[PDB]
Every structure is written in C-alpha cells, then in structure tokens.
RNA sequence: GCGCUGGAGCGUCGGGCCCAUACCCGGCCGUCGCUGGCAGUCGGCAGAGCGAGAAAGAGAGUGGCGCGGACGCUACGCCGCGACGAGUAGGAGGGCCGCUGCGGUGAGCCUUGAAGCCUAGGGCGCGGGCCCGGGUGGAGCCGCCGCAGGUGCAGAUCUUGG
C-alpha cells in the first residue's frame, strides 16, 4: 500500500454559493468566466466572496 | 525535373544509415545545389446556358453522426504488409499438411505467392494433391528438397487465379497447367529414390512418437 | 488585403522552428560533451590506479557520493521514527526507489533505516536505464511521464537543465543543483526482483538483502527494472 | 489526451527525440563491432593457415 | 430490416449474477433484496474468504455502455403517442418503452407512428 | 546562439547562410 | 431576459419530463427536443423552429419576429414548403444562415427538417 | 490417415494450496518431462474433446455430438515438463484427468 | 496424515520452479487534487491559434465562378490530467432508492381492463430497487417540481393470527 493519511486529503473550501438565488447565480457565472480567463486575482477574489455565506460577508457600514 | 535516383545511404540496420548527416550531405553534393526565391460547369439548353454543380449538396441528412477517429501512422492495410517465411522453407522442399482436407501427406513447395501464402502442389498422380495455397503457419517443413531451380511455373497464377469464386467446377486450365508443372516436378522427383512412395504416404503419429524429440 | 500578415506569420512560425532547430542541436553537442566527459572519468581512475600499482603504492578511490534506496519491507509494523525518515526519503510504497547524495547526514539517515532499505552505488547504465524506462517528472505535483524534453525544460530551464541528457549527467555527478532534480524526479515504482530476494530480513552482510549492498546494487537494478 | 509512454531503450525514435545522440551513437558502435568482428575472422584465418 | 443504433459497442460486464443477500438462502422471511450487514462477528462483512461478496463501487459498469439494452439503445417509457415526438431526433442512440397501463387501441397508434418515425419500440407486439 | 533574446540575430544570419 | 428565465424554466416547466436517467423537453419550438439553454424555444429573442405540416406533406418552419416579444399571438410566423428535400434543406439553410437569425442551431433544424421529411414519405 | 495431435491430461487448474484461477488450466503432455523439451509446444493449440446428449453443428461435415473448447498454450510451468494452458471457456473439472488433444498446425518449425 | 532410512532426517549450501487482494504495465468504476479548460458556435458583417523552456501584441496610426463549414453548452452542463480506494462504534454527503397524503404539473393512464398477486419470461442499475412479457382482477392508478410524516424489520424468552 502506500504510507499516506487521508485526514486532510479532502479541501473543505466551497466551490459555489449555498444558495438557490438566480441572480447571485447568475453574477457567479459572470465572475466564474472572468476569473477564468483573466489574470488579475480581484475577480477571484469577489468570486470567493460571492461563494461565502451571509456571516462572512458582514454588512459594511457607510 | 530530373530522373529519380535510389537512396545514397546503405541501411545499416531499421531506421539507421551507415552515413552520418555531413556525410550524406556530402554525398548529396549539396554544397552546389542551393536554391532560393472546378465545381461548376456549363452547358447549354435549348433558355440559354445553365451552370450545372457536381457534387451536389447531400439530399438526406442523419439525425446523428459518429465524431472522425484520431489519425495513426503505421496501420498498413493488409495488400502492402512485408511477408515473411520461415527459415526452413525454400523452394523445392517437401511439407507436411496438417489442417485442410490433405492433412497429413506429404506436398512439393513452389514458391511463395503475393499474398504471402505458400503454392504448393503434389503430383496428383501421387497424393491427390492439386495447385493449392497453403498456410505457412499451418505447414510442417521438413529437411527434404529437391532442386527445382530449373523448372518455370506459369506466370498466369496469382492470389486472384486461385481466389474462390462463389457445386464446385473444374476449369480446363486448371487441368492444363497442373499438368504443365507435372510434367516438370515427377520427372524431378523420381531421380531420387524411393520418394514417390513417400509422397504417397501420410503422416501419422503412433504410441511413443513425439514432436518434440523426433526431428524432420 | 491580409498579404502581409500571412506573409508575417509565415515568419514568425519559421523564426520559431529555427530557434526548435538550434535548440535540438545544442542539446545534441552538449550529449557528445557528456559522452566524452564519461570516458575521461571512466579512464582516469583506471590510469590513476595503474600508476599506483606500478610506483608499488596503493590509490584509495574516490568514496561514492551518489546512491539509490529501495525499500523493500511493508507499511505494516514500523517504527514511528524509521517511518518518518522513510516518508523523508520519499519511499513510501514497497520497491519504490531514489537517488541520494551521500553525507554526513544521508549516511546517518541511511544507518537509522538501514534494516527496511537496501542501497547501493549505482553506475551510469543503471541511471540511464531508471531515467528512461522509470524515469518520470514531477510537474505541477502531479506524475507526468517524460515522454518529450520540453517537460524537463519548463521546469528546469532556469538550473542549466534542458533536456534528459543534462538531468542524467547532474545525477550521475552530483552538480550543484542537484536537489532540485532530484525533488522534481518522482521516486522509481519498480517492479519486484525477477528471480527473487535471497532473504528480506537479513542484512546482505549476513545473506540478505538489507543494507549497504556497495556495488551489488546494479544487479538488483538489472531485474527490478 | 493521456500520451502513451513508450520505451526508449525499446523504441528507436522515441530515444532519439529524448536524446539526438543515441542515433549517432548507436551507428559508431555497430560500425566498430563489424570492423572488429571481421579483424578478428582474418586474424584467425591467417593463424589457422600458419598453423596449417 | 431492426433498425440497428448509430454504434454497437462491446458491452463487457464485470458482474452479470445479482448480488445474493447474506442468508436469503437459509429463510424465507429474508428475502433476494441485497441487504449490508452491521454484525459484529458477520462473516460476510468482514468479507472472509469463499463468502458472498459485496457490491462494492468497483462493480460499477463502464459509463459508455451503461443502462444500454444488448440491441444498443436505451430504454424510455412512453405513454401516448404525443411523447414519441421527444424521442424523434434521438433515433439512433434511443428507444420507446410501451407502458404496461396502455391500451391496445392507443398502442396500436403507438408502434404505427414509431414505425413511420423510424423508433425501435421493445415490445411492437405486446397485446395485439 | 539557441538563447531566444540573444541568439535572434545569430538564428538570422544561419537563416540566411541556408539561403 | 434570457438567462433570467433559464434559471427558473430549467428544472420548473410543465415541458420539463424526467425518467430513465434521461430528462427532455416538450416545448412547441425546440429543436432536438432535449432540454437545454441553447435549444430552449421560449426563452430567447429569436427562435426557430420546424415541425410536419397540417397535411401529410411538407413542413411549416415558425420564426419568432423582434417587435411583438410579449405578444405571443403575432410573435410567430408560419411558412409552409412543400418542395423537394434538396430544395427545402437549401431554403432552410439560407433563412438561417444569410439572415442570421439563431445560427447556432442551423444544422439541428436541418436534421429535425430532414427526418420528418423521411417520415412523411410512405414505409415500406 | 492417423493421430495428428500429442496427447496430453489435464492435471488440474493454476491453482494454489488454497485457491485455484480457472482461468490457467495445467497440462501434461505425453513424452516431454523437462523444461527444455516444452519449448516447443509453446504457442500450440489445445482442444478438449467431448460429447454431448443432443447434436450439434460440425464444420465440413454432418452435424453430430461431439463439442469442444478451443486453448492455446502460454507458458512452461515447473521443471517437469508441465505447461499452462489458457481456454475461450474455464475448463469443467470433470476434465480432471482426461485427454486433451495438442496440434501441431501452430507449427513453428 | 500416508509414509520416509544412497532421506521425504539432521548441519552448511548452489541452480531451477511454485503463488497473496503484495509489486510493475494495462482496462473499467468511484473519491480527491490541479478550487484545471470550455460563453470562441467571435463564418461572403467571416478567416479557424494561443502546448510553447525562457515576463510581455499572428495591435493600430505619422514621415523618410461555385452562397458552404460534424457534435457541443440539461454552465447544478461538458471535458482533460495526475494520486488514492480497508474498516467496528461514530460523523458527513449523494440517492432518477422505497411508502402515504397535500399544492402544482403531464390536452397523463384507464371496462379495447387500474391497483393487488403469481410467473422455468426479456432486461437495466454495483446496490437501494425499477421498466416491459404471460395468467387471475373488475375500478381506480402513476411520472416530474415542491411540502408534510404514525415512512423501510430478522431477531427484542417482541404483539396478534395461521
Ligand atoms: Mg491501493
Ligand atoms: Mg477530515
Ligand atoms: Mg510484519
Ligand atoms: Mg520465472
Ligand atoms: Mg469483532
Ligand atoms: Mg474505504
Ligand atoms: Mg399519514
Ligand atoms: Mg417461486
Ligand atoms: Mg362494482
Ligand atoms: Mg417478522
């Protein structure tokens, strides 16, 4: 066999919003395209945000 | 242009030339050979002239169709594949039928056809045996010959002569030139003694005949 | 009009096939300097221990400094400390090989795991032979077979590395970045020794096959490989 | 697509596209194999016929 | 002429016999429905050697032939005639399936449009 | 000569000793 | 829009039928008659479609116009052909290509054209 | 108009001492005993002949009784002159210690 | 165990051979990772690429007939590479696994025969199970999208009945 242990062998990191909203799913593909087939990390890094669920996204005051 | 001219390098082995590249470019004499720098038709009508297109668009269309496979290299088709023989079979050699109808007797070897099967024939007088193709694989060859270096068969016989057509008939010609050979092989075998007879025989195995311990 | 760009991309395309043509014959005379670099190593300790013998002194060899570790016992029944060298030398699966450079501490690591590995000093066919046959690359952390010298270049260009030539001649003579193709070698899956072992459990001092197997390595290599 | 590796100690044009030099190499070796193969048939043809 | 599917793979199967639950055999309250045990000293599930063997993901068949009738297609249930219509361009890879509550009326409608419309029906002649 | 940056002007002057 | 009334027709619509791990679409205009974003014929500006004629011959090819999207009773067009295969795979072709309206799927109307074309014909 | 086949038994499957595949069938051929005396039988064709209640279809000739299984010959197997043998179907072990005809026309002379 | 004594015993050993789910290559399934690639189907309103060892444009401007082009893309979809696959108690995820009823939906099925039941019948799915064929039945029944539960038995010296 091999010596590898599969206790962190899986990444816990979301891949798509937990959501069934069209619209967030819909900015989720624009951002998807563009994080894809761009090379700035900013779109990656909205993209991640909109993954993220209500709690860590609080609501920024003015 | 000019006249096509053979390969300057010998083969050394598959693949590899016994001459290096400046040697061949030397050889090439390249150094003083430098260099630098339909679908419509018309026809008339008796109207005026109409152009009439060949290879017209296709009338019917299937409701789906299979992708192109990806492209290989060396998946020859079976007219221009390299045929090989064993090193045990020359022409004039006597061979033992395992497998068709003529199991088990002894045949006279011709020579090797285009389709890389063997011609082989017996005297018909002897065996029974006519003009016909054999297997190398399937055929025993044993360390009998006899020397036919001076014999001509027809040249009129190839794969397609003996390609079955569609009860079975027998033409003229092939009396007539299994005659032919005959009339060039018997004579050939009956200087050697006691080889009609054997022709005759067939091959047999009895209790404590093996293969692998006799040899032919 | 598009005159010029069909023309223009005609150039680029040949500019590059060029530079493919020059680099195919760079790595073919830097191949020739390996060759003739072999020879002269070769002869030299020859010609070296012939002028001892003849002066009536002796010449002690150059000790190794390249050798390959097999591990040849099981997952099951390891010490936690010999396990953990064992994933430190990237043996994790049985008959799974690697090149290591000798030291201080590689001899010591060697010694602590000395009962579950059998290592030697391997030769020049022996890295020829691994390289191209069980030879693969580690690329983006995956298993990539090097099946082209582009594989190698992409990855170790910037170390003077261009094609499996250069990587072989840097394992065979330790050069100085030797640890980054080394790491970039994904570790030998061999197969099991046509055969077979004499005995697993006992050091090959004693009849086995564990342990410092100095120049006997080669022909474990001939059948595991 | 997954590329099949073939062998280059088995294959011939896959060695020489990893490495030029094997072409070169293996030509000068059965070059000089043949050569001393046929030097040492003569040279036992002359000691037999010394012999003799 | 049966009208032949677009390709005719070579459906190789890994396991052809159903998978037997444990001691279905033995009682007759147990029935032929695979069941996975949860004994502590089962034999079955601790896998022990010459027992039953249980359906493990490897038993999975090749995702290019699979759900694929030994004819090449795919079986769909169909009801009316108006759900032919969905299987019309998807001639050569599909089926129709009759549905057992059907008519014999409307089943003879039925086999007649997919017959016109060039669909393989598994059982053209069921009732009659 | 095989460096790309470098070698640009070399692989020019070869292309043009072939022609 | 468009995307807007995919994300809720895709696994809502009465069109919608699943079974036998195979899932399509029984809208009026959609080709292949599999349900998916670009076959959709309710969802998009401009859609084509072609379906058997009243009688036993020929076939009616309906066009989605572009002033009338929210008046369904003047948003289609009905031409009926009644010609030769060859002919009216060229006039099929040349509606969608040389108007460019929806040239994603000329080819699949082309096939859905050409099958009932062989349907309509007598079975031997 | 003889035997053109060597005799040989079906000694049993590649088997263990616990467990059997049966998909290699052991042969042992009349006459050979030794490992440099297989070599040629390697590559030959093996057939088990048998026969059967109803009739059955016979190439070049009357349908009759009598069935077979088609094999080739893989590889040695032992010192003693034991081959392996591999069939289009499993071999049944009611074979166990019966004839099984070895060809000659996989010639390789 | 049978038996074994120029061993089939004892000590030192040499070849050869035998086979595990172990190792090497290959096929298939699934998981994980590359949080990889695909909106570029940009077509007589056109020009077919971004696999290539080397950070960045097949970038633009100022002067010296024939009317043609396969699939794709349910983006919760498709596709490409690698590594891995044991499991009690226990945890999590996917169920186009199963039952009952409710809101929608199938111009759904049905006395030209529904549920139920039997079947040496044809199959599919790894599996939970499911779809057709044949016989009895005479009046109801199901698929998809959501909702709800008194929702799945081999045991409990389980309850009732046989
Ligand atoms: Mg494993
Ligand atoms: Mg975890
Ligand atoms: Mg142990
Ligand atoms: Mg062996
Ligand atoms: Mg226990
Ligand atoms: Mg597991
Ligand atoms: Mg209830
Ligand atoms: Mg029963
Ligand atoms: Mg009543
Ligand atoms: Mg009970």
Same mark, same amino acid.
């Given at each position: 066999?091999?010596?590898?242990?599969?206790?962190?062998?899986?990444?816990?990191?979301?891949?798509?919003?937990?959501?069934?909203?069209?619209?967030?799913?819909?900015?989720?593909?624009?951002?998807?395209?563009?994080?894809?087939?761009?090379?700035?990390?900013?779109?990656?890094?909205?993209?991640?945000?909109?993954?993220?669920?209500?709690?860590?996204?609080?609501?920024?005051?003015? | 242009?000019?006249?096509?001219?053979?390969?300057?390098?010998?083969?050394?082995?598959?693949?590899?030339?016994?001459? +290096?590249?400046?040697?061949?470019?030397?050889?090439?004499?390249?150094?003083?050979?430098?260099? /630098?720098?339909?679908?419509?038709?018309?026809?008339?009508?008796?109207?005026?002239?109409?152009?009439?297109?060949?290879?017209?668009?296709?009338?019917?269309?299937?409701?789906?169709?299979?992708?192109?496979?990806?492209? +290989?290299?060396?998946?020859?088709?079976?007219?221009?594949?390299?045929?090989?023989?064993?090193?045990?079979?020359?022409?004039?050699?006597?061979?033992?039928?395992?497998?068709?109808?003529?199991?088990?007797?002894?045949?006279?070897?011709?020579?090797?056809?285009? +389709?890389?099967?063997?011609?082989?024939?017996?005297?018909? +007088?002897?065996?029974?045996?006519?003009?016909?193709?054999?297997?190398?694989?399937?055929?025993? /060859?044993?360390?009998?010959?006899?020397?036919?270096?001076?014999?001509?068969?027809?040249?009129?016989?190839?794969?397609?002569?003996?390609?079955?057509?569609?009860?079975?008939?027998?033409?003229?010609?092939?009396?007539?030139?299994?005659?032919?050979?005959?009339?060039?092989?018997?004579?050939?075998?009956?200087?050697?003694?006691?080889?009609?007879?054997?022709?005759?025989?067939?091959?047999?195995?009895?209790?404590?005949?093996?293969?692998?311990?006799?040899?032919? | 009009?598009?005159?010029? %760009?069909?023309?223009?991309?005609?150039?680029?395309?040949?500019?590059?096939?060029?530079?493919?043509?020059?680099?195919?014959?760079?790595?073919?005379?830097?191949?020739?300097?390996?060759?003739?670099?072999?020879?002269?190593?070769?002869?030299?300790?020859?010609?070296?221990?012939?002028?001892?013998?003849?002066? !009536?002194?002796?010449?002690?060899?150059?000790?190794?400094?390249?050798?390959?570790?097999?591990?040849?016992?099981?997952?099951?029944?390891?010490?936690?400390?010999?396990?953990?060298? %064992?994933?430190?030398?990237?043996?994790?699966?049985?008959?799974?090989?690697?090149?290591?450079?000798?030291?201080?501490?590689?001899?010591?690591?060697?010694?602590?795991?000395?009962?579950?590995?059998?290592?030697?000093?391997?030769?020049?066919?022996?890295?020829?032979?691994?390289?191209?046959?069980? !030879?693969?690359?580690?690329?983006?952390?995956?298993?990539?077979?090097?099946?082209?010298?582009?594989?190698?270049?992409?990855?170790?260009?910037?170390?003077?590395?261009?094609?499996?030539?250069?990587?072989?001649?840097?394992?065979?003579?330790?050069?100085?970045?030797?640890?980054?193709?080394?790491?970039?070698?994904?570790?030998?899956?061999?197969?099991?020794?046509?055969? !077979?072992?004499?005995?697993?459990?006992?050091?090959?001092?004693?009849? !086995?096959?564990?342990?410092?197997?100095?120049?006997?390595?080669?022909?474990?290599?001939?059948?595991?490989? | 697509?997954?590329?099949?590796?073939?062998?280059?100690?088995?294959?011939?044009?896959?060695?020489?596209?990893?490495?030029?030099?094997?072409?070169?190499?293996?030509?000068?070796?059965?070059?000089?194999?043949?050569?001393?193969?046929?030097?040492?048939?003569?040279?036992?043809?002359?000691?037999?016929?010394?012999?003799? | 002429?049966?009208?032949?599917?677009?390709?005719?793979?070579?459906?190789?199967?890994?396991?052809?016999?159903?998978?037997?639950?444990?001691?279905?055999?033995?009682?007759?309250?147990?029935?032929?429905?695979?069941?996975?045990?949860?004994?502590?000293?089962?034999?079955?599930?601790?896998?022990?050697?010459?027992?039953?063997?249980?359906?493990?993901?490897?038993?999975?068949?090749?995702?290019?032939?699979?759900?694929?009738?030994?004819?090449?297609?795919?079986?769909?249930?169909?009801?009316?005639?108006?759900?032919?219509?969905?299987?019309?361009?998807?001639?050569?890879?599909?089926?129709?399936?009759?549905?057992?509550?059907?008519?014999?009326?409307?089943?003879?409608?039925?086999?007649?449009?997919?017959?016109?419309?060039?669909?393989?029906?598994?059982?053209?002649?069921?009732?009659? | 000569?095989?460096?790309?940056?470098?070698?640009?002007?070399?692989?020019?002057?070869?292309?043009?000793?072939?022609? | 829009?468009?995307?807007?009334?995919?994300?809720?027709?895709?696994?809502?619509?009465?069109?919608?039928?699943?079974?036998?791990?195979?899932?399509?679409?029984?809208?009026?205009?959609?080709?292949?008659?599999?349900?998916?974003?670009?076959?959709?014929?309710?969802?998009?500006?401009?859609?084509?479609?072609?379906?058997?004629?009243?009688?036993?011959?020929?076939?009616?090819?309906?066009?989605?116009?572009?002033?009338?999207?929210?008046?369904?009773?003047?948003?289609?067009?009905?031409?009926?052909?009644?010609?030769?295969?060859?002919?009216?795979?060229?006039?099929?072709?040349?509606?969608?290509?040389?108007?460019?309206?929806?040239?994603?799927?000329?080819?699949?109307?082309?096939?859905?054209?050409?099958?009932?074309?062989?349907?309509?014909?007598?079975?031997? | 108009?003889?035997?053109?086949?060597?005799?040989?038994?079906?000694?049993?499957?590649?088997?263990?001492?616990?467990?059997?595949?049966?998909?290699?069938?052991?042969?042992?051929?009349?006459?050979?005993?030794?490992?440099?005396?297989?070599?040629?039988?390697?590559?030959?064709?093996?057939?088990?002949?048998?026969?059967?209640?109803?009739?059955?279809?016979?190439?070049?000739?009357?349908?009759?009784?009598?069935?077979?299984?088609?094999?080739?010959?893989?590889?040695?197997?032992?010192?003693?002159?034991?081959?392996?043998?591999?069939?289009?179907?499993?071999?049944?072990?009611?074979?166990?210690?019966?004839?099984?005809?070895?060809?000659?026309?996989?010639?390789?002379?």
């Amino acid at each position: 066999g091999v010596d590898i242990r599969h206790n962190k062998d899986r990444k816990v990191r979301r891949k798509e919003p937990k959501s069934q909203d069209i619209y967030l799913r819909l900015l989720v593909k624009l951002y998807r395209f563009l994080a894809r087939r761009t090379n700035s990390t900013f779109n990656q890094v909205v993209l991640k945000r909109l993954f993220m669920s209500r709690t860590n996204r609080p609501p920024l005051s003015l | 242009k000019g006249k096509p001219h053979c390969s300057r390098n010998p083969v050394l082995v598959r693949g590899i030339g016994r001459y +290096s590249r400046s040697a061949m470019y030397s050889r090439k004499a390249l150094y003083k050979r430098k260099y /630098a720098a339909l679908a419509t038709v018309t026809k008339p009508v008796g109207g005026g002239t109409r152009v009439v297109k060949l290879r017209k668009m296709p009338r019917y269309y299937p409701t789906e169709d299979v992708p192109r496979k990806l492209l +290989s290299h060396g998946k020859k088709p079976f007219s221009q594949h390299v045929r090989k023989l064993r090193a045990s079979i020359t022409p004039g050699t006597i061979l033992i039928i395992l497998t068709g109808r003529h199991r088990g007797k002894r045949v006279v070897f011709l020579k090797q056809l285009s +389709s890389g099967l063997l011609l082989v024939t017996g005297p018909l +007088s002897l065996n029974r045996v006519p003009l016909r193709r054999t297997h190398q694989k399937f055929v025993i /060859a044993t360390s009998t010959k006899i020397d036919i270096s001076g014999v001509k068969i027809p040249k009129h016989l190839t794969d397609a002569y003996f390609k079955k057509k569609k009860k079975y008939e027998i033409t003229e010609q092939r009396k007539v030139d299994q005659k032919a050979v005959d009339s060039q092989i018997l004579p050939k075998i009956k200087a050697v003694p006691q080889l009609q007879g054997y022709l005759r025989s067939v091959f047999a195995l009895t209790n404590g005949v093996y293969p692998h311990k006799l040899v032919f | 009009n598009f005159a010029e %760009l069909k023309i223009k991309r005609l150039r680029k395309k040949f500019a590059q096939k060029m530079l493919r043509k020059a680099r195919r014959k760079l790595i073919y005379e830097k191949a020739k300097h390996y060759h003739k670099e072999y020879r002269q190593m070769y002869r030299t300790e020859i010609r070296m221990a012939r002028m001892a013998r003849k002066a !009536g002194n002796f010449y002690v060899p150059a000790e190794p400094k390249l050798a390959f570790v097999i591990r040849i016992r099981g997952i099951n029944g390891v010490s936690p400390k010999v396990r953990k060298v %064992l994933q430190l030398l990237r043996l994790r699966q049985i008959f799974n090989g690697t090149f290591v450079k000798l030291n201080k501490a590689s001899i010591n690591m060697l010694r602590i795991v000395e009962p579950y590995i059998a290592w030697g000093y391997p030769n020049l066919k022996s890295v020829n032979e691994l390289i191209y046959k069980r !030879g693969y690359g580690k690329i983006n952390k995956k298993r990539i077979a090097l099946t082209d010298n582009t594989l190698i270049a992409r990855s170790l260009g910037k170390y003077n590395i261009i094609c499996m030539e250069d990587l072989i001649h840097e394992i065979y003579t330790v050069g100085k970045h030797f640890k980054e193709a080394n790491n970039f070698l994904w570790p030998f899956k061999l197969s099991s020794p046509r055969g !077979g072992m004499k005995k697993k459990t006992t050091h090959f001092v004693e009849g !086995g096959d564990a342990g410092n197997r100095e120049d006997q390595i080669n022909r474990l290599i001939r059948r595991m490989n | 697509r997954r590329v099949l590796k073939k062998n280059p100690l088995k294959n011939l044009r896959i060695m020489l596209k990893l490495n030029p030099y094997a072409k070169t190499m293996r030509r000068n070796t059965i070059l000089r194999q043949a050569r001393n193969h046929k030097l040492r048939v003569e040279r036992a043809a002359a000691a037999l016929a010394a012999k003799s | 002429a049966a009208l032949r599917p677009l390709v005719k793979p070579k459906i190789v199967k890994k396991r052809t016999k159903k998978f037997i639950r444990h001691q279905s055999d033995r009682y007759v309250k147990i029935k032929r429905n695979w069941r996975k045990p949860r004994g502590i000293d089962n034999r079955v599930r601790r896998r022990f050697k010459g027992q039953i063997l249980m359906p493990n993901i490897g038993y999975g068949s090749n995702k290019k032939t699979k759900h694929m009738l030994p004819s090449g297609f795919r079986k769909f249930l169909v009801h009316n005639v108006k759900e032919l219509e969905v299987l019309l361009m998807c001639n050569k890879s599909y089926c129709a399936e009759i549905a057992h509550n059907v008519s014999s009326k409307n089943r003879k409608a039925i086999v007649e449009r997919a017959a016109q419309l060039a669909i393989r029906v598994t059982n053209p002649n069921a009732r009659l | 000569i095989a460096h790309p940056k470098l070698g640009r002007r070399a692989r020019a002057r070869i292309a043009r000793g072939l022609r | 829009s468009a995307h807007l009334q995919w994300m809720v027709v895709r696994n809502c619509s009465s069109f919608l039928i699943k079974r036998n791990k195979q899932t399509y679409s029984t809208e009026p205009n959609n080709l292949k008659a599999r349900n998916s974003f670009r076959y959709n014929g309710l969802i998009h500006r401009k859609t084509v479609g072609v379906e058997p004629a009243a009688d036993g011959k020929g076939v009616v090819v309906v066009m989605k116009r572009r002033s009338g999207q929210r008046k369904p009773a003047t948003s289609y067009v009905r031409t009926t052909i009644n010609k030769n295969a060859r002919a009216t795979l060229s006039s099929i072709r040349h509606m969608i290509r040389k108007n460019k309206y929806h040239p994603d799927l000329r080819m699949a109307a082309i096939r859905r054209a050409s099958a009932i074309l062989r349907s309509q014909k007598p079975v031997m | 108009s003889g035997r053109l086949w060597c005799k040989a038994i079906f000694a049993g499957y590649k088997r263990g001492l616990r467990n059997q595949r049966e998909h290699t069938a052991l042969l042992k051929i009349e006459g050979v005993y030794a490992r440099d005396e297989t070599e040629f039988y390697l590559g030959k064709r093996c057939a088990y002949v048998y026969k059967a209640k109803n009739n059955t279809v016979t190439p070049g000739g009357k349908p009759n009784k009598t069935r077979v299984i088609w094999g080739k010959v893989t590889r040695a197997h032992g010192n003693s002159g034991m081959v392996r043998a591999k069939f289009r179907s499993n071999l049944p072990a009611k074979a166990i210690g019966h004839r099984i005809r070895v060809m000659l026309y996989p010639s390789r002379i």
